[PDB]
Design a protein around this ligand. Structure first.
Ligand SMILES: CNC(=O)[C@H]1CCNC1
Length: 164
């Protein structure tokens, strides 16, 4: 069903996450973590305290798809086991911010061809696929985008609801 998902998404905030490679998204799906540059780390920490759910919607650059979405379960923290992210040419692990814990809500892909009717008011009403890493997605657009993904029957949202 979609009812528990709608409950998790009620009054949530949404952020577009752009990764240069599939390796980082696969790591995030396996380990339940994300890290971003400090400018975006600060925004996500503010958002985490402000709303009952903060949703990250992931897209690998040049893939033509989103790769899933997850909910922040923590603010960023430093000093864990170093995650072996593949950073793009010119980027070093020192340039990253802290580590956020995330709970995946959907690990399934959605092609951009399916979201062409959704525009993001916070990015000049451009199609929601368009945006820099960290672009916030307005509530209605983000809710409808998450509802377009195929259901991920491997995930039980009962375990996310209790953290809210
Ligand atoms: C693992 N973290 C990333 O790949 C971030 C870095 C900047 N945009 C995506």
């Amino acid at each position: 069903g979609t009812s528990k998902l709608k409950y998790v998404l009620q009054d949530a905030r949404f952020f577009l996450i752009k990764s240069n490679n599939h390796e980082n998204v696969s790591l995030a799906k396996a380990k339940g973590v994300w890290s971003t540059l400090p400018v975006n780390e600060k925004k996500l920490n503010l958002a985490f305290r402000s709303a009952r759910s903060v949703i990250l919607i992931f897209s690998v650059r040049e893939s033509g798809k989103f790769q899933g979405f997850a909910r922040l379960s923590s603010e960023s923290h430093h000093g864990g086991s170093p995650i072996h992210w593949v950073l793009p040419a010119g980027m070093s692990a020192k340039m990253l911010g802290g580590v956020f814990k995330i709970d995946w809500i959907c690990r399934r892909e959605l092609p951009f061809t399916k979201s062409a009717h959704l525009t993001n008011p916070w990015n000049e009403h451009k199609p929601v696929k368009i945006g820099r890493d960290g672009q916030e997605i307005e509530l209605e657009c983000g809710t409808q985008l998450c509802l377009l993904f195929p259901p991920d029957e491997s995930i039980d949202l009962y375990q996310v609801i209790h953290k809210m």
